[PDB]
Curated annotation (Swiss-Prot):
Disordered: annotated span: 115-135
GO cellular component: cytoplasm; cytosol; cytosolic ribosome; cytosolic small ribosomal subunit; extracellular exosome; focal adhesion; membrane; nucleolus
Subunit record text: Component of the small ribosomal subunit. Part of the small subunit (SSU) processome, composed of more than 70 proteins and the RNA chaperone small nucleolar RNA (snoRNA) U3.
Keyword Ribonucleoprotein among UniProt keywords: yes
InterPro entries according to UniProt: Ribosomal_uS11, Ribosomal_uS11_CS, Ribosomal_uS11_sf
Protein name per UniProt: Small ribosomal subunit protein uS11
Amino acid sequence: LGPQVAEGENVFGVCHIFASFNDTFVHVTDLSGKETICRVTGGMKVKADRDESSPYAAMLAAQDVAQRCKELGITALHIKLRATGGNRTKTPGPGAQSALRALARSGMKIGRIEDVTPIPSXSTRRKGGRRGRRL
RNA sequence: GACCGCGUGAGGCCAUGAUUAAGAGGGACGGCCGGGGGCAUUCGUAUUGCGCCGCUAGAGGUGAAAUUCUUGGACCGGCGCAAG
């Protein structure tokens, strides 16, 4: 099923890769970003909570996303990386690189790659305290 | 104002009398310069909340966890609003 597309033509979804230090999201939408095609989360594929954000868990999430997209006809993806952002960290998580590689290795093609991490033009105060999270 | 003379007057006379303008200071003036100050105004994302839509079973959190939040739809995505 899906869209009735020609031989050489490809169709684009947008893949939102949200990669925090606790968990990894491999959400795939349409081009408008409104219609979810498939969302598989990195903590859907493991048992321990410590392995939610491991790169092996983001790989398994990335494989079961592309398998779901190609049986809806989606051929290529624009990539949107995303860290936590805001007051929190701006570097994307450990499963950011391994999901993007595994998405490429499973017969899925790549459009643009962008960064849509929330960046405060300012910020409310962070959740640490003044002396700030000592351990 | 000293000084001499002369009728409270009319005089002479003094080279007649005011150091300088501080690499002290105050003040004027000139074109500037500055996250200085006060009042008003404008803007920016973000966060939180909220509506509505989409798909879902986990989300979150940590050294590891649990309290917590979720099929009544959480989290993630999209549009919109609100407030500080």
